[PDB]
Design a protein around this ligand. Structure first.
Ligand SMILES: O=c1[nH]c2cc(C(F)(F)F)c(N3CCOCC3)cc2n(CP(=O)(O)O)c1=O
Ligand SMILES: Oc1nc2ccc(-c3c(Cl)cccc3OC(F)(F)F)cc2[nH]1
Ligand SMILES: CCCCCCCCCCCCCC
Ligand SMILES: CCCCCCCCCCCCCC
Ligand SMILES: CCCCCCCCCCCCCC
Ligand SMILES: CCCCCCCCCCCCCC
Ligand SMILES: CCCCCCCCCCCC
Ligand SMILES: CCCCCCCCCCCC
Ligand SMILES: CCCCCCCCCCCC
Ligand SMILES: CCCCCCCCCCCC
Ligand SMILES: CCCCCCCCCC
Ligand SMILES: CCCCCCCCCC
Ligand SMILES: CCCCCCCCC
Ligand SMILES: CCCCCCCC
Ligand SMILES: CCCCCCCC
Ligand SMILES: CCCCCCCC
Ligand SMILES: CCCCCCC
Ligand SMILES: CCCCCCC
Lengths: 124, 130, 55, 162, 24, 147, 77, 51
């Protein structure tokens, strides 16, 4: 059919794809620092992390007004991790493991919107 | 072609400017020459006429759709001739309509008495599926 | 009874006033003709201005 | 590169527009009788094969234009006049001004091609479900390829002057 | 239909941005 | 601010078509004209849209004629009567000017407006869209209308 | 004239178009998160936009959003 | 155009106000002309009996 939650699941597919490029550009920046100017590698990382956290804030806000609380539970723990980084503002091995999980989490949830949206459109 | 005789009006900016002019949203660039301004004004007139006509037609469609009345009473069914109403071929309804001395039912009887399609059905299930 | 009651057409049924026809190019071509004429006139005046500037 | 993409386009637009106006398979109406430009050939009309010419007889100015289809033909006349203007790049070269004369004819045919359809659709209608055949879509390619050839012929003239 | 057109335009713009970023 | 005879025309054309103006007048005596023209074009476009919406919503088709004394002055619709009968004899010996003009028009009329039978008359009426009119009895006219 | 389900869809589509235009103007005209909201607001209210997108991938968002606000406003009226 | 943030809020709210006003004025004027054009004078006795 046509519901407000069905449209919210459609905007996520276009927006979550942009969040994929951020975590992919992150592992590239960490790969360059592992091989080795150093200011440009970290200052750019500070500029890319802010939109990634703000865009996900809409994912927790769109589904809140869409009454789809079954999907919100799959995004609340992701937003809680952003509060730890925002509060406090070797490290290479720790941050590397803290970024590979982002690519897997932003991809497994990406397939949900590709299927949960179909579960409402064709189900008219 | 006009604005490049030998400005900022290439082949990529011209499409953008014309798209912005069609949507009545405007752009930062504008034709500097005379014939380019003529083209812009003619396109503006065309898109204004198109948008106004589309809005008017949509309003008319919505108003006509909202101003509808379903057939409820027998007086509405007698006046409305788009739907043909019939009864059983041999039953009590036909005998009642044949002896109904009411102006509301007399016109209905004279309408059902003369009709090219089948206005009388033998079996009630056949009339139901019809 | 013999003239108006035994009629073949009804005023109520004929005046449907529903399902108006969608607008087609049959009556909109007046603006497309003017658009093409204006484009041609603009191309002509541009060519004339170029010829005058070259001379 | 662009000097050769124009001569091949002129022979791929004129030779393609002359076909769309030749074969009478533009409109499909209902028996199902396919229509055309100057004459329609009926089908399933109580006869196996019949093909007869249509008879069209201040609104009289639109009927003569629909009968005497000059606009869908004038675009083909301008395509050949512009096709020989770009052919003048080898003989009598170094002119740097004959290429501009081809960019005007390549777009003047597109204005006369979109018009040839407006006079054809307004006269067609002037329920019955009618569709557009494959032969009618060929004329549409005679306008899209008329604009790509009109942007590639003038761009060369700008590069030659610069 | 206009919402579908909006979503399709956003997706096409994202794809074109990806192509233009990978072009360099 | 230049606002020549050309730039002023361009600005007024951009303001009339609801498009984005290139520049705005700097002086107060130009801003007044700009605002007045904006209000004028807004009112005009709103009224045009409202009237075009009122047109396509409901239709009111009026007849091209309303009486016999009106069609005798326009002379744009060729009207015909019966060949031999009461109508022809009545229009023949008519002292009033209107019916006399109608008869002297129907006499020298090409092609022949006279019809042999009323069936062919009503057939020609149904065939011709707005270029024919028949003059018959009111009873038969109402009966044909109700058929 | 418009159902409450459409008003909730317009606001999130307005912000959704705005955040995409900011992302498009980031991979490469400023078009920040603030200017994109202003340009989209000036385009939805049929007003004159301050600036236009320079890149092709940014012009697509502008032209599509222009067609969106044109259909919605015409349907509302 | 307003350069500050709160200045843009004033323009945004004013833009929403003039949009509703103009749209309501055009929609109301269309209703006036439509109702005026959809009028029927009393002609027959059946119309006078009902009215
Ligand atoms: O005494 C009678 N009792 C009837 C009972 C019924 C019902 F109970 F509703 F079945 C019906 N139907 C209603 C509509 O048509 C199909 C059957 C008709 C009846 N009739 C008329 P008949 O059947 O034409 O004789 C009688 O005369
Ligand atoms: O000689 C010719 N020039 C032409 C230009 C365009 C079209 C056309 C196409 Cl390609 C697709 C759909 C509708 C079309 O015609 C319309 F008028 F728009 F309905 C046909 C043409 N034939
Ligand atoms: C639609 C997404 C396509 C992504 C393509 C990525 C290609 C990367 C090539 C270079 C890889 C370098 C790894 C160290
Ligand atoms: C942008 C300026 C457009 C001017 C259009 C003028 C059209 C004139 C049409 C005249 C029709 C006369 C019918 C009797
Ligand atoms: C009344 C019918 C008139 C038909 C006129 C047809 C004219 C065709 C001209 C073709 C020119 C080809 C060169
Ligand atoms: C320019 C932005 C304007 C925003 C206006 C928001 C108005 C909200 C009204 C809510 C009414 C709720 C009624 C149940
Ligand atoms: C009108 C007489 C000549 C008809 C020629 C028909 C040619 C059809 C070619 C089809 C190519 C796809
Ligand atoms: C009724 C006669 C029709 C003849 C059609 C001839 C078409 C010639 C086209 C030439 C294009 C260059
Ligand atoms: C400085 C200009 C002030 C506004 C004058 C025109 C306003 C539009 C017309 C109002 C008519 C009552
Ligand atoms: C570069 C942008 C070209 C125009 C794309 C959007 C046009 C408006 C929507 C059309 C939907 C059919
Ligand atoms: C719908 C039941 C749960 C509501 C949670 C609100 C926070
Ligand atoms: C299809 C090749 C061209 C056919 C027409 C040739 C000229 C005819 C002039 C009457
Ligand atoms: C135009 C702005 C509409 C905002 C609606 C907010 C929900 C009622
Ligand atoms: C130099 C390439 C121009 C392409 C123009 C295409 C117009 C449809
Ligand atoms: C400032 C120049 C004015 C020129 C007027 C020309 C009128 C035809
Ligand atoms: C280019 C600056 C982006 C800032 C984003 C702030 C979101 C609240
Ligand atoms: C063929 C002409 C291309 C111009 C591109 C301008 C950006
Ligand atoms: C950068 C892309 C330019 C395209 C020009 C033709 C549309």
């Amino acid at each position: 059919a046509f519901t407000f939650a069905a449209f919210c699941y459609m905007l996520t597919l276009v927006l979550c794809a942009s969040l994929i490029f951020f975590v992919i550009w992150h592992i590239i920046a960490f790969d360059e620092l592992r091989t080795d100017n150093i200011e440009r590698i970290c200052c750019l990382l500070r500029k890319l992390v802010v939109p990634e956290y703000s865009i996900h804030g809409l994912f927790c806000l769109m589904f809140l007004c869409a009454a789809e609380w079954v999907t919100l539970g799959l995004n609340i723990p992701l937003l809680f991790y952003h509060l730890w980084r925002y509060f406090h503002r070797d490290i290479l091995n720790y941050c590397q493991k803290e970024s590979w999980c982002k690519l897997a989490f932003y991809l497994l949830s990406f397939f949900y919107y590709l299927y949960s949206m179909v579960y409402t459109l064709v189900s008219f | 072609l006009v604005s490049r005789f030998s400005n900022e009006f290439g082949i990529f900016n011209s499409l953008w400017f014309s798209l912005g002019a069609f949507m009545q949203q405007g752009c930062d660039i504008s034709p500097r020459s005379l014939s380019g301004r003529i083209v812009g004004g003619v396109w503006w007139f065309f898109t204004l006429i198109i948008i106004s006509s589309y809005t008017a037609n949509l309003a008319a469609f919505l108003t006509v759709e909202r101003m509808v009345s379903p057939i409820e009473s027998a007086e509405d069914l007698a006046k409305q001739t788009e739907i043909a109403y019939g009864t059983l071929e041999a039953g009590s309804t036909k005998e009642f309509f044949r002896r109904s001395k009411i102006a509301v039912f007399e016109k209905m009887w004279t309408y059902m008495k003369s009709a090219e399609p089948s206005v009388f059905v033998r079996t009630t299930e056949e009339g139901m599926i019809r | 009874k013999w003239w108006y009651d035994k009629g073949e057409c009804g005023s109520g049924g004929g005046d449907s006033k529903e399902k108006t026809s969608a607008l087609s190019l049959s009556n909109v071509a007046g603006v497309f003709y003017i658009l093409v004429g204006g484009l041609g006139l603009a191309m002509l005046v541009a060519l004339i201005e170029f010829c005058y500037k070259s001379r | 590169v662009q000097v050769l993409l124009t001569t091949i386009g002129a022979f791929s637009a004129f030779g393609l527009m002359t076909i769309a106006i030749s074969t009478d398979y533009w409109l499909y109406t209902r028996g199902l009788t396919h229509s055309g430009l100057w004459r329609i050939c009926c089908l399933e009309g109580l006869k196996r094969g019949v093909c007869v010419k249509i008879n069209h007889f201040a609104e009289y100015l639109l009927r003569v234009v629909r009968a005497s289809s000059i606009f869908p033909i004038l675009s083909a006349i301008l395509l050949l006049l512009g096709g020989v203007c770009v052919a003048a790049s080898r003989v009598y070269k170094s002119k740097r001004n004959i290429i501009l004369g081809a960019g005007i004819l390549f777009v003047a045919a597109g204005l006369s091609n979109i018009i040839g359809v407006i006079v054809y659709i307004s006269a067609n209608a002037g329920k019955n479900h009618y569709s557009y055949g494959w032969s009618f879509y060929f004329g549409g390619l005679s306008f899209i390829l008329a604009e790509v050839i009109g942007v590639l012929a003038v761009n060369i003239y700008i590069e030659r002057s610069r | 239909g206009v919402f579908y057109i909006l979503i399709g335009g956003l997706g096409l713009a994202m794809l074109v941005a990806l192509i233009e970023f990978c072009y360099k | 601010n230049e606002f020549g005879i050309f730039n002023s025309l361009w600005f007024s054309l951009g303001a009339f078509m609801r498009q984005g103006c290139d520049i705005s007048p700097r002086s107060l005596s130009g801003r007044i004209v700009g605002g007045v023209w904006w209000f004028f074009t807004l009112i005009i476009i709103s009224s045009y849209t409202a009237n075009l919406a009122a047109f396509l919503t409901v239709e009111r088709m009026v007849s091209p004629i309303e009486s016999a004394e009106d069609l005798s002055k326009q002379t744009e619709i060729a009207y015909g009567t019966l060949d031999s009968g009461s109508t022809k004899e009545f229009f023949r010996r008519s002292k009033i000017a209107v019916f006399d003009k109608m008869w002297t028009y129907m006499r020298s009329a090409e092609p022949s407006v006279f019809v042999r039978t009323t069936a062919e008359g009503v057939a020609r009426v149904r065939k011709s869209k707005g270029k024919y009119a028949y003059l018959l009895e009111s009873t038969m006219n109402e009966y044909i209308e109700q058929r | 004239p418009l159902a409450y389900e459409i008003w909730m869809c317009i606001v999130f589509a307005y912000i959704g178009v705005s955040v995409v235009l900011f992302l498009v103007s980031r991979f490469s005209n400023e078009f920040g998160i603030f200017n994109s909201l202003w340009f989209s607001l000036g385009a939805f209210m049929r007003q004159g936009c301050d600036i236009s997108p320079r890149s092709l991938s940014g012009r697509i968002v502008g032209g599509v959003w222009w067609f969106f606000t044109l259909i919605i406003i015409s349907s509302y009226t």
